[PDB]
Amino acid sequence: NQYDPSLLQPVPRSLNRNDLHLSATLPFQGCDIWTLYELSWLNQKGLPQVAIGEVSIPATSANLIESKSFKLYLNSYNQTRFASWDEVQTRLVHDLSACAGETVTVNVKSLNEYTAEPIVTMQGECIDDQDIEIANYEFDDALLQGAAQGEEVSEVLHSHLLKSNNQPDWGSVEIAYHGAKMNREALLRYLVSFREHNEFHEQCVERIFTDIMRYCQPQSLTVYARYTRRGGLDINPFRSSHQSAPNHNQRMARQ
Amino acid sequence: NQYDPSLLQPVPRSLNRNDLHLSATLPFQGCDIWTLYELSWLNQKGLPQVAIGEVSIPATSANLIESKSFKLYLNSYNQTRFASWDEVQTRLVHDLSACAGETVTVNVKSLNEYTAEPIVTMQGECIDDQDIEIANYEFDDALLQGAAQGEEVSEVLHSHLLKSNALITNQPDWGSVEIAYHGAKMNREALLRYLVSFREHNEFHEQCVERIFTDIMRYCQPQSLTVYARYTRRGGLDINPFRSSHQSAPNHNQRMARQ
Amino acid sequence: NQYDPSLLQPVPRSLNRNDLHLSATLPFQGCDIWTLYELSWLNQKGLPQVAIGEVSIPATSANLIESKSFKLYLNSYNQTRFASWDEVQTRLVHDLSACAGETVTVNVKSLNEYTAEPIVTMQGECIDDQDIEIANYEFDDALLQGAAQGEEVSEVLHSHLLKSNNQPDWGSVEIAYHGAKMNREALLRYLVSFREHNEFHEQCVERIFTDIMRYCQPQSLTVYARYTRRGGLDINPFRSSHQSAPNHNQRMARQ
Amino acid sequence: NQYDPSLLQPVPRSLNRNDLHLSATLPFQGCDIWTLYELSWLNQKGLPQVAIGEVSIPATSANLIESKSFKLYLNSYNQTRFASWDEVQTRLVHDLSACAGETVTVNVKSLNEYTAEPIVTMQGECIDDQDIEIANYEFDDALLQGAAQGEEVSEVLHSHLLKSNALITNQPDWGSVEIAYHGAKMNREALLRYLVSFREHNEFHEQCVERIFTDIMRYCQPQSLTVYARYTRRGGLDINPFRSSHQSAPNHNQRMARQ
Ligand SMILES: [Cl-]
Ligand SMILES: [Cl-]
Ligand SMILES: [Cl-]
Ligand SMILES: [Cl-]
């Protein structure tokens, strides 16, 4: 198995967005940030090289990249000789851009760039410690009905309780908004109800964004989730009414 | 599927050790340290809980625990209600100890315990930055023949270049390895070629560490030796086998960059 | 006063580096991150526009930019009509790159990109709460002699107590390293001794880096300081043995 | 230079108000909220302390405090040893109240109190995004003549476009302003042109807010009005004047993006 760009499989963003009752004109902007922990190839002399890739795919791209296919594509680098680290970054930009349908940003970082980098947590207030009982795990977006009745605020909330299905995927999510203050029990119950829900990580973030916008009507909204890796890759979708990218890319405890 | 300890699959250590032709007395001591990044369950009221586990299995245990089965076992907690964090930790100790055949240690930590914990590298000198050509990756232990010619020295060397055989594991697995020894100085080209050759071998993880230890012992004959690998996670957990002539365990569990 | 690039004044990085006994080959890599809080100009129709600029200047550039001159240069935009926000970003890149001597990165952000952005603190452990007496404020780099005797660690430490002089400037600083564990009292005393010391912000960060490297000999070192603004601009120098840029740009409480 | 309360410079409010031709009874109530971002001093053992102060001065005080003098006064704390944080807060209240001529409120907060505090924007609709041409920036209050033609409405409007006269302040100063009123609906083009015209005026900060209030009152005649500006800091502190027919103060001190 030598280097093989045809392993990459796009999935159109439209599939789920149509499900969310979205027009071609988006309520949000943003990007999908991917971390590639397994990136490895051979140098020109056949000596293995290892790196961590950091990739940003614009949320306006026609397609996302299916994660298993991304992994298989990356494995095709492992036994292939490349002229330099620059050639590797160039090939990644080229192939991932073609697949997504829009220019993708790629940084290929040596492992020593991570030495003494701290693990971080999310910004704002954690909503997870609530003494409440969950009697049903079925997804219910109506859990947000009347969820923001409070005074006008700007607030950042987060939760580590995102899970979606067949093996489970795990995430933390940060919600920053300007609008009527949100009921934290309703928000927590809403997030927990994704547990048996099936969908891609990018799709969950867009669903949270559009449900909050519909039910809660904030003036400004940002939703940023950081998911644990599968197949050596993690995905961190960011969707915002006013912001193009998150102001930090740093790994969380489970990542 | 809810809590199911029957999902755990023991593998006798002797299966792979037999092929190393050891002495009745194990040449090394040590442990297998696992990090469980996915640990989650429900509290008594049904609210999800999340944690990171850290498990140490003695290298003297009769059995290791097969990694896929360990993943499936942990997944069985996800939808199960437990009365307390103590209960979860206690069951982990019970079930994993039963599987391995010896008492295992388990720490269940809240995510906040990791905030600000730094990513680490290994001790000593990295040997990866060499101007050499490699074209044949087949496993060759003979690459170590005559590898230690030096004056007797104490050093610590490490490499980030361990990778498994893709056919054997289906998807490649990845690791870094740290080798600390006192003995005739080891040729770093020979050692690097040898480590790289694991990508065409049939042993990885715990078996790879024991193979490296036994091959270095026989070819290089050091007075003291420690071989410690830290592998990237597969299925939400990672394995970090430590084997040594004189030492029991690494001084911590801190994660490396790819982990 | 219309737009005037000649207001920009470079200062060579060599001035201080020569003082630190540095070769032309640097012990560190990095960048100076600037935040421009006062950026304003007129659109093509004469209607004022306001934005926050984010600028990164490579630490390899021949020159830094003197802060008062940067402010005066930016004021020259205030009464000048520009075709679009893109033209403004283009002119900033052009002029700042010419002044620094290397390509500078510029992002011009609308104010609504900051709505509901949280204030952050530094990573790792704060060293400031120590019950110790300071009898002298004179700069002493020898405070670090024998300061790292401890076991091999990877650690992140920070302090909010950086001050340098004529009006005072204020900063917080984050030190991430892999090496022998540092004595936190010695480090705190060392940082406090900058109080009456005179130098540019970039110069302080490089001095901390080189003093720690000389006295403490860590395998890997990163020093990142975030200073409070003067004249509407703040400077955030980042210097690292292995890292090119910080992984977060976010304002601290005093910024 | 160590602690020196004589550095504080009072300015009588009447100096500028005289030019507004008010009634013996002030038409508004309110306060000037200041944020002190640079506050630092030494503890009894000489170790530096850092904090952010928040000060509220009643709009009825005889005097305002000149901003440069306030900066210099605060700088005088930097090298001075104080026994406790309480002592620092107490002296601030004493000295600032003496200067202003009325009791001022002072909160001294540790930096950790700001962690996670979000940046805010103002209430209501931003009026800045208009397709209009402006070429003459001279101050013109007459821009408000006949500006409120509407049916009576309650609305809140804001603009980020306040800037001072560069010659007068030497270096330009910057602010956003929020105007909440009940009355005949205000023409937004007229209001924007008027606000933009402050860049060629001789009044800013507290005086600008009072001028805006008095001009809107006379030209537009609303039943109720509040004018609140938040200015970017100069010399490490910022001023946020609030003036209202019916309201005492804003509900908080949260910083805006440029602040
Ligand atoms: Cl518990
Ligand atoms: Cl390390
Ligand atoms: Cl105190
Ligand atoms: Cl807001």
Short mmCIF file of C-alpha atoms in Angstrom, two decimals, chain D residues 15-259:
data_model
loop_
_atom_site.label_atom_id
_atom_site.label_comp_id
_atom_site.label_asym_id
_atom_site.label_seq_id
_atom_site.Cartn_x
_atom_site.Cartn_y
_atom_site.Cartn_z
CA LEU D 15 -17.39 74.20 34.56
CA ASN D 16 -18.71 72.20 31.60
CA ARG D 17 -22.36 72.11 32.68
CA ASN D 18 -22.57 75.90 32.63
CA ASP D 19 -22.14 75.65 28.85
CA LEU D 20 -25.11 73.26 28.65
CA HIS D 21 -27.41 75.95 30.11
CA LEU D 22 -29.17 73.56 32.48
CA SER D 23 -31.95 74.27 34.97
CA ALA D 24 -31.03 74.79 38.63
CA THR D 25 -32.36 71.24 38.99
CA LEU D 26 -30.19 68.73 37.09
CA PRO D 27 -32.24 67.10 34.26
CA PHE D 28 -30.50 63.75 34.83
CA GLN D 29 -29.19 61.44 37.52
CA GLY D 30 -26.49 58.82 37.24
CA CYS D 31 -22.87 57.95 37.88
CA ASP D 32 -19.40 57.68 36.38
CA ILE D 33 -18.12 54.12 36.56
CA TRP D 34 -14.35 53.72 36.23
CA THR D 35 -12.40 50.50 35.72
CA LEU D 36 -8.84 50.50 37.06
CA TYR D 37 -6.93 47.83 35.19
CA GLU D 38 -3.45 48.65 36.54
CA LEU D 39 -3.93 48.66 40.32
CA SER D 40 -0.83 47.30 42.06
CA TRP D 41 0.99 47.85 45.32
CA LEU D 42 3.31 46.01 47.72
CA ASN D 43 2.27 43.98 50.75
CA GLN D 44 3.82 44.50 54.17
CA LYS D 45 6.70 42.16 53.28
CA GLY D 46 7.33 43.90 49.97
CA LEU D 47 5.75 41.35 47.63
CA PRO D 48 3.76 42.91 44.80
CA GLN D 49 -0.02 42.59 44.72
CA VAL D 50 -2.20 43.06 41.64
CA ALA D 51 -5.92 43.78 41.35
CA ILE D 52 -8.59 45.37 39.20
CA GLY D 53 -10.56 48.20 40.79
CA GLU D 54 -14.08 49.34 39.97
CA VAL D 55 -15.13 52.83 41.09
CA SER D 56 -18.50 54.56 40.95
CA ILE D 57 -18.69 58.33 41.29
CA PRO D 58 -22.17 59.89 41.69
CA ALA D 59 -23.10 62.33 38.91
CA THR D 60 -24.20 64.70 41.67
CA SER D 61 -20.65 64.96 43.04
CA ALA D 62 -19.29 68.51 42.94
CA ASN D 63 -16.23 67.35 41.02
CA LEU D 64 -15.12 64.80 38.54
CA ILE D 65 -11.57 63.44 38.70
CA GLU D 66 -9.19 64.31 35.90
CA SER D 67 -8.10 61.06 34.22
CA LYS D 68 -4.34 61.71 33.99
CA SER D 69 -4.21 62.70 37.66
CA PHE D 70 -6.15 59.54 38.56
CA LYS D 71 -3.53 57.48 36.67
CA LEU D 72 -0.63 59.22 38.43
CA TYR D 73 -2.34 58.79 41.81
CA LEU D 74 -2.76 55.06 41.21
CA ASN D 75 0.86 54.75 40.04
CA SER D 76 1.89 56.17 43.43
CA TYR D 77 0.63 52.95 45.04
CA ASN D 78 2.96 50.75 42.98
CA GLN D 79 6.05 51.01 45.21
CA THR D 80 4.17 51.55 48.47
CA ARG D 81 3.73 48.90 51.17
CA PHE D 82 0.24 48.46 52.61
CA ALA D 83 -0.72 46.10 55.41
CA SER D 84 -3.77 44.58 53.73
CA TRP D 85 -6.10 44.68 50.74
CA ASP D 86 -8.69 46.23 53.03
CA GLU D 87 -6.32 49.13 53.70
CA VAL D 88 -5.90 49.75 50.00
CA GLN D 89 -9.65 49.72 49.35
CA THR D 90 -10.27 52.01 52.33
CA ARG D 91 -7.71 54.59 51.19
CA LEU D 92 -9.12 54.57 47.67
CA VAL D 93 -12.59 55.30 49.02
CA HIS D 94 -11.26 58.05 51.28
CA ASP D 95 -9.09 59.84 48.71
CA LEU D 96 -11.45 59.56 45.75
CA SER D 97 -14.46 60.63 47.85
CA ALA D 98 -12.51 63.65 49.11
CA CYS D 99 -11.59 64.63 45.58
CA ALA D 100 -15.04 64.18 44.08
CA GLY D 101 -16.79 65.85 47.00
CA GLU D 102 -19.19 62.96 47.60
CA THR D 103 -18.86 59.36 48.77
CA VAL D 104 -17.62 57.11 45.97
CA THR D 105 -17.85 53.32 45.95
CA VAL D 106 -14.75 51.20 45.37
CA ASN D 107 -14.41 47.46 44.82
CA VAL D 108 -10.92 45.96 44.70
CA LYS D 109 -11.01 42.53 43.08
CA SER D 110 -8.36 39.83 42.65
CA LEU D 111 -7.53 38.88 39.07
CA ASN D 112 -9.03 35.40 39.52
CA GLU D 113 -12.43 37.05 39.95
CA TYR D 114 -12.34 37.86 36.24
CA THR D 115 -11.58 34.40 34.94
CA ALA D 116 -14.26 33.33 32.51
CA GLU D 117 -16.00 36.73 32.57
CA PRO D 118 -17.30 37.33 29.07
CA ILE D 119 -16.87 40.36 26.86
CA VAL D 120 -20.22 42.09 26.24
CA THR D 121 -21.85 44.34 23.65
CA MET D 122 -24.54 46.92 24.28
CA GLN D 123 -28.31 46.54 24.35
CA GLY D 124 -30.64 47.05 21.42
CA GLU D 125 -29.92 47.78 17.78
CA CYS D 126 -26.56 48.94 16.45
CA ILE D 127 -27.05 51.91 14.12
CA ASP D 128 -23.57 51.91 12.56
CA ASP D 129 -24.36 49.83 9.50
CA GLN D 130 -25.80 52.55 7.30
CA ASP D 131 -25.30 53.34 3.67
CA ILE D 132 -24.66 57.06 3.99
CA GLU D 133 -21.83 59.39 3.08
CA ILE D 134 -20.12 61.54 5.66
CA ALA D 135 -17.56 64.13 4.57
CA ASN D 136 -17.86 66.98 7.04
CA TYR D 137 -17.16 65.98 10.62
CA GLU D 138 -17.57 69.35 12.33
CA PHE D 139 -19.72 69.21 15.49
CA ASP D 140 -23.28 70.05 14.62
CA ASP D 141 -26.03 69.67 17.23
CA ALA D 142 -28.54 70.94 14.68
CA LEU D 143 -28.25 67.56 12.97
CA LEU D 144 -30.90 66.53 15.52
CA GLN D 145 -33.41 69.19 14.43
CA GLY D 146 -36.67 67.43 13.59
CA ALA D 147 -35.00 64.08 14.18
CA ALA D 148 -37.88 62.51 16.08
CA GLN D 149 -40.88 62.38 13.79
CA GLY D 150 -42.20 58.99 14.70
CA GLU D 151 -45.04 57.39 16.57
CA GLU D 152 -44.12 57.14 20.24
CA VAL D 153 -42.00 54.05 20.78
CA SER D 154 -39.62 52.53 23.29
CA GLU D 155 -36.30 51.50 21.86
CA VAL D 156 -32.62 51.08 22.64
CA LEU D 157 -30.02 52.09 20.05
CA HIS D 158 -26.24 51.94 20.18
CA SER D 159 -23.16 53.03 18.22
CA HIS D 160 -19.47 52.14 18.40
CA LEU D 161 -18.46 55.32 16.52
CA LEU D 162 -17.59 57.92 19.23
CA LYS D 163 -14.11 59.39 18.81
CA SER D 164 -12.57 62.52 20.35
CA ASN D 165 -10.91 65.49 18.71
CA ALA D 166 -7.31 64.52 18.28
CA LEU D 167 -5.96 68.06 18.77
CA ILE D 168 -7.91 68.56 21.98
CA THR D 169 -7.00 65.25 23.61
CA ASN D 170 -3.70 65.05 21.73
CA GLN D 171 -4.25 61.36 21.06
CA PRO D 172 -7.74 60.28 20.07
CA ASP D 173 -10.08 58.66 22.58
CA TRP D 174 -12.74 56.10 21.65
CA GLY D 175 -16.14 54.98 22.87
CA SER D 176 -19.44 53.19 22.32
CA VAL D 177 -22.75 54.69 23.38
CA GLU D 178 -26.17 53.25 24.19
CA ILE D 179 -29.28 55.41 24.05
CA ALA D 180 -32.55 54.11 25.52
CA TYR D 181 -35.65 56.27 25.22
CA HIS D 182 -39.41 56.44 25.07
CA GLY D 183 -40.69 59.08 22.68
CA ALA D 184 -41.22 59.93 19.05
CA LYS D 185 -39.06 57.58 16.99
CA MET D 186 -35.59 58.96 16.23
CA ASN D 187 -34.19 59.19 12.71
CA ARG D 188 -31.14 56.90 12.79
CA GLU D 189 -29.23 58.70 10.03
CA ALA D 190 -29.54 62.00 11.90
CA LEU D 191 -28.49 60.36 15.17
CA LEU D 192 -25.48 58.66 13.55
CA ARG D 193 -24.31 61.86 11.81
CA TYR D 194 -24.64 63.68 15.13
CA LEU D 195 -22.62 61.14 17.11
CA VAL D 196 -19.92 61.01 14.44
CA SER D 197 -19.64 64.79 14.63
CA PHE D 198 -18.13 64.57 18.11
CA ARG D 199 -14.72 64.00 16.53
CA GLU D 200 -14.53 67.70 15.81
CA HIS D 201 -15.99 68.77 19.16
CA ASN D 202 -14.23 69.87 22.30
CA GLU D 203 -16.13 67.66 24.77
CA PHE D 204 -15.62 63.93 25.42
CA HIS D 205 -16.08 61.39 28.20
CA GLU D 206 -18.41 62.64 30.92
CA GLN D 207 -19.05 65.90 29.10
CA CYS D 208 -19.89 64.11 25.85
CA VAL D 209 -22.49 61.95 27.58
CA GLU D 210 -24.11 65.00 29.20
CA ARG D 211 -24.07 66.89 25.89
CA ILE D 212 -25.72 63.97 24.07
CA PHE D 213 -28.38 63.71 26.79
CA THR D 214 -29.15 67.42 26.82
CA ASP D 215 -29.22 67.71 23.01
CA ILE D 216 -31.52 64.70 22.63
CA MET D 217 -33.77 66.09 25.37
CA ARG D 218 -34.10 69.48 23.68
CA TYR D 219 -34.32 68.36 20.03
CA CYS D 220 -36.25 65.09 20.39
CA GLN D 221 -38.20 65.65 23.58
CA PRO D 222 -38.53 62.03 24.78
CA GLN D 223 -40.60 61.16 27.84
CA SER D 224 -37.73 59.10 29.25
CA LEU D 225 -34.07 58.89 28.25
CA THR D 226 -30.84 57.16 29.25
CA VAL D 227 -27.46 57.84 27.64
CA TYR D 228 -24.58 55.54 28.59
CA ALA D 229 -21.12 55.53 27.05
CA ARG D 230 -18.25 53.13 27.62
CA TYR D 231 -14.87 54.53 26.62
CA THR D 232 -11.65 52.63 25.97
CA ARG D 233 -9.00 53.05 28.65
CA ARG D 234 -6.34 55.74 28.62
CA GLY D 235 -3.45 55.38 31.04
CA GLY D 236 -4.74 52.10 32.40
CA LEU D 237 -8.24 53.15 33.37
CA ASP D 238 -11.55 53.71 31.61
CA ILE D 239 -14.58 55.86 32.18
CA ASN D 240 -18.20 54.82 31.68
CA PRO D 241 -20.59 57.76 32.25
CA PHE D 242 -24.29 56.92 32.75
CA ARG D 243 -26.99 59.64 32.68
CA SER D 244 -30.71 59.08 32.83
CA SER D 245 -33.98 60.79 33.47
CA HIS D 246 -35.32 57.77 35.44
CA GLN D 247 -32.47 55.24 36.10
CA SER D 248 -29.55 55.32 38.59
CA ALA D 249 -26.86 53.10 37.05
CA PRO D 250 -26.14 50.29 34.60
CA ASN D 251 -26.77 46.79 35.91
CA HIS D 252 -23.09 45.86 35.68
CA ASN D 253 -19.50 46.83 34.77
CA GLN D 254 -18.76 44.15 32.12
CA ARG D 255 -16.13 45.22 29.56
CA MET D 256 -16.75 45.67 25.83
CA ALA D 257 -14.48 44.37 23.06
CA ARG D 258 -12.23 47.44 22.75
CA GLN D 259 -12.06 48.01 26.49
#
